Amino acid sequence: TLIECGASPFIPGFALKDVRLENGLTVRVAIGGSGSPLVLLHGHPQNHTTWRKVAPTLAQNHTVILPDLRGYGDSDKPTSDPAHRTYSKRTMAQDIVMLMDALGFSRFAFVGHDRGGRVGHRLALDYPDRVTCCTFIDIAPTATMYALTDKSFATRYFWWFFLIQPFPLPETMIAHDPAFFLRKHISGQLKIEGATSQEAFNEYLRCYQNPEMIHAICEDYRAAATIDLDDDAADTSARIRCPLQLLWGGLGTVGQLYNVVGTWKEKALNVQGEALPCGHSPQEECPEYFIQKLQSFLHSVL
């Protein structure tokens, strides 16, 4: 089913909808434009408004679909399970093809940022015929990150060891001052004169202040250290079939620590990538440069 929730107050030309999937979950989505389907999927601690600066341009040549991850934004936030399956990337990925089935699309182009990229990686493996191409933003594979855990990794990515502690520790810490934690996750990501306005920060905060999101976020991270790694090892011999593009911040953390394109070679057939003049979020920090790079890739995929 589709319920219409008015126009997007943040992204001109896009309509907000609540879509009920066959797995009984309801997701919040913003849709705009016309043409071949393009899904842009946000990460943590954002929601789909992270695409507000690029989405309208992209909508000129595509039907742009901006979902809120389960547990995030305004999508449902189901209570979880002890193995964290409910927030595994496999379940998240399944949410994405079921949404597409519900909007009537068959094959689609996919772009994913932060958590959204991890969902995408699993999406491209579980449903290789559905995805025409992939663009993963500012991430190296989940299994690779944890496998290379060293003093330096654990220091620079300390949340990857804090957000995974057993319930309710991280949930309790964050709840002490949600805005403070959000600032760390956002001002650490940018650090280049105001890529996130007070209005956009308030919108992300509005969502982040819901303890149900706080918990989903921790379950997502817990899954990434457990069930997601089980799933990723079970089919480690498999490779992403569609063309893959990596876009990452030359001044972000992952770009300063690893050869980004190099981390995706064993995981995919045809790969390519480049560093952008920003930190963690090129769609917010250097939108115009981001669009150009995404357009070239999308239009090159036959």
Task: Say how far apart CA 302 and CA 121 lie, in whole Å.
Answer: 20
| Rounded least distance, CB 215 to a copy of itself, Å | 17
114 carries an active-site annotation? yes
Please report, for residues 7, 15, 135, 208, 278, the alpha-carbon distance to residue 109 in angstroms, rounded to integers and kept in the order given. Answer: 24, 20, 9, 28, 24
Contact between 284 and Cl ion by CB under 5 A: the answer reads no
CB 246 within 8 A of CB 264: yes
Tokens 């609540």 -> residue:
18
Tokens 């936030």 -> residue:
77
280 carries an active-site annotation? yes
Could you tell me how many residues of this chain bind a copy of itself (CB under 8 A)? Answer: 22
Choose the stretch contacting Ca ion; rule: CB under 5 A; options: 82-90, 132-140, 169-177, 180-188: 180-188
- Choose the one of Cl ion, a copy of itself, Ca ion, none that binds residue 169, judging by a C-beta under 5 to 8 angstroms depending on kind: a copy of itself
| Rounded least distance, CB 157 to a copy of itself, Å | 9
CB 116 within 8 A of CB 142: no
Choose the stretch contacting Ca ion; rule: CB under 5 A; options: 44-52, 87-95, 208-216, 268-276: 44-52
Torsion of the alpha carbons at 173, 174, 178 and 183, rounded to the nearest 10: 110
Contact between 57 and a copy of itself by CB under 8 A: the answer reads no
The catalytic position among 76, 114, 228, 232 is 114
Contact between 258 and a copy of itself by CB under 8 A: the answer reads no
| 271-276/244-249 β-pairing | parallel
Determine the residue type at 239: R
- Choose the one of a copy of itself, Ca ion, Cl ion, none that binds residue 149, judging by a C-beta under 5 to 8 angstroms depending on kind: a copy of itself
Determine the residue type at 194: G
Binding site for a copy of itself (CB under 8 A): 146-147, 149-151, 153-155, 158, 160-162, 164-165, 169, 172-173, 176-177, 180, 184, 225
